[PDB]
Design an enzyme around this catalytic site. Structure first.
Site, mmCIF file in Angstrom:
data_model
loop_
_atom_site.group_PDB
_atom_site.id
_atom_site.type_symbol
_atom_site.label_atom_id
_atom_site.label_comp_id
_atom_site.label_asym_id
_atom_site.label_seq_id
_atom_site.Cartn_x
_atom_site.Cartn_y
_atom_site.Cartn_z
ATOM 1 N N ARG A 120 0.755 -1.229 0.000
ATOM 2 C CA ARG A 120 0.000 0.000 0.000
ATOM 3 C C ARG A 120 0.783 1.273 0.000
ATOM 4 O O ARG A 120 0.389 2.263 -0.630
ATOM 5 C CB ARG A 120 -0.947 0.036 1.193
ATOM 6 C CG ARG A 120 -1.954 -1.069 1.181
ATOM 7 C CD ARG A 120 -3.006 -0.815 2.230
ATOM 8 N NE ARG A 120 -4.043 -1.815 2.215
ATOM 9 C CZ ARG A 120 -5.089 -1.848 3.031
ATOM 10 N NH1 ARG A 120 -5.286 -0.901 3.910
ATOM 11 N NH2 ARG A 120 -5.940 -2.842 2.951
ATOM 12 N N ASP A 148 -3.994 4.157 4.851
ATOM 13 C CA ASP A 148 -3.050 3.917 3.801
ATOM 14 C C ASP A 148 -3.691 3.448 2.487
ATOM 15 O O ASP A 148 -2.974 3.187 1.535
ATOM 16 C CB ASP A 148 -1.961 2.953 4.259
ATOM 17 C CG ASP A 148 -2.487 1.684 4.750
ATOM 18 O OD1 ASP A 148 -3.708 1.457 4.664
ATOM 19 O OD2 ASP A 148 -1.682 0.898 5.274
ATOM 20 N N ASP A 149 -5.022 3.368 2.458
ATOM 21 C CA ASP A 149 -5.756 3.125 1.219
ATOM 22 C C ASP A 149 -6.513 4.354 0.765
ATOM 23 O O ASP A 149 -7.409 4.270 -0.038
ATOM 24 C CB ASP A 149 -6.645 1.916 1.336
ATOM 25 C CG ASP A 149 -7.527 1.913 2.571
ATOM 26 O OD1 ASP A 149 -7.711 2.907 3.324
ATOM 27 O OD2 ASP A 149 -8.058 0.816 2.797
ATOM 28 N N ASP A 203 -11.964 6.523 15.210
ATOM 29 C CA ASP A 203 -12.711 7.584 14.504
ATOM 30 C C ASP A 203 -13.939 8.024 15.309
ATOM 31 O O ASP A 203 -14.191 9.214 15.429
ATOM 32 C CB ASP A 203 -13.004 7.239 13.020
ATOM 33 C CG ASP A 203 -13.710 5.892 12.811
ATOM 34 O OD1 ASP A 203 -13.789 5.064 13.736
ATOM 35 O OD2 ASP A 203 -14.190 5.671 11.675
ATOM 36 N N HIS A 246 -13.940 3.591 1.196
ATOM 37 C CA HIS A 246 -14.418 2.475 0.362
ATOM 38 C C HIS A 246 -15.632 1.758 0.933
ATOM 39 O O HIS A 246 -15.915 0.659 0.534
ATOM 40 C CB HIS A 246 -13.305 1.495 0.053
ATOM 41 C CG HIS A 246 -12.696 0.860 1.260
ATOM 42 N ND1 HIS A 246 -13.400 0.037 2.116
ATOM 43 C CD2 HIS A 246 -11.425 0.903 1.735
ATOM 44 C CE1 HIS A 246 -12.594 -0.366 3.095
ATOM 45 N NE2 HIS A 246 -11.391 0.138 2.877
#
Ligand SMILES: O=c1ccn([C@@H]2O[C@H](COP(=O)(O)OP(=O)(O)O)[C@@H](O)[C@H]2O)c(=O)[nH]1
Ligand SMILES: [K+]
Ligand SMILES: [Mn+2]
Length: 243
Positions: free
Chosen positions: A21, A87-88, A157, A181
């Site tokens: 990644r 990291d995506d 989060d 995503h």
């Protein structure tokens, strides 16, 4: 007057994703905003330490300890804005800067893509300015003089959102410009794509969710579409193919 220099971009990663990644992000968006970008990981790495120096922060571990590490580093930087991504995520720093310019400079801001109290999905990226982040410290740090019992079993989060909304009377500012995503990304194409602050890739609901770009890289060479996105945004990039 807000500049890119005022932004601290923190990327969460882990050793197992350095090759799969992180290298992808370094060839791409991180290459355009390296001075502002900090990669938080849990193991050293030669390639990355080479390309990043003090921008690779290896942590040796209220909030998880990589997330605590990001907030502490941000606060030590003195910079005005903290933006966290996974990291995506792909970050368009020019779109980011234009969004951030939009906020009154003397108000607490928490901005991101809402999810269910309201909170910004970590996987879409979210930003907080220094004056809010400094108010969060007693909870974020797990201090013995605030009640963090509600916080211990929340993900990072949601913890951020809970502290801000439920402890500090603040509010998430939603933006449609941040994307995870957990979102049907194929509804964003080459027209919408340069205006977004973050994009993402990943599997959700049995599907590989990615942005819709025909190229210039094949899906086989560029399954995330991040190289193709990057080439769209920066066509001067010498390793960009034609189509
Ligand atoms: O053991 C782990 C697994 C994941 N991650 C990080 O957590 C975030 C989300 O990871 P992933 O996309 O694989 O999880 P998912 O999206 O399925 O929740 C990314 O920034 C990863 O680098 C991590 O720090 N440690
Ligand atoms: K927590
Ligand atoms: Mn993911």
């Amino acid at each position: 007057e807000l500049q890119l220099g005022d932004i601290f971009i923190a990327v969460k990663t882990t050793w197992a994703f350095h090759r799969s990644r992180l290298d992808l992000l370094l060839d791409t968006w991180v290459s355009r905003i390296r001075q502002q970008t900090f990669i938080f990981t849990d193991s050293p790495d030669e390639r990355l330490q080479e390309r990043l120096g003090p921008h690779l922060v290896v942590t040796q571990c209220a909030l998880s300890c990589k997330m605590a590490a990001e907030f502490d580093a941000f606060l030590v930087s003195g910079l005005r804005w903290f933006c966290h991504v996974d990291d995506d995520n792909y970050v368009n720093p020019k779109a980011l800067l234009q969004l951030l310019k939009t906020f009154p400079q003397d108000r607490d801001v928490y901005v991101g893509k809402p999810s269910l109290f309201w909170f910004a999905t970590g996987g879409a990226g979210f930003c907080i300015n220094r004056q809010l982040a400094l108010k969060m410290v007693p909870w974020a740090s797990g201090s013995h003089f605030v009640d963090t019992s509600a916080l211990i079993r929340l993900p990072d989060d949601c913890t951020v959102g809970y502290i801000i909304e439920c402890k500090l009377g603040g509010r998430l500012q939603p933006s449609p410009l941040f994307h995870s995503h957990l979102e049907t990304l194929q509804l964003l194409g080459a027209a919408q794509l340069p205006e977004q602050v973050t994009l993402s890739y990943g599997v959700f609901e049995g599907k590989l969710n990615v942005i819709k770009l025909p190229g210039p890289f094949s899906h086989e060479e560029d399954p995330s579409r991040f190289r193709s996105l990057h080439c769209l945004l920066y066509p001067d990039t010498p390793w960009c193919p034609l189509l």
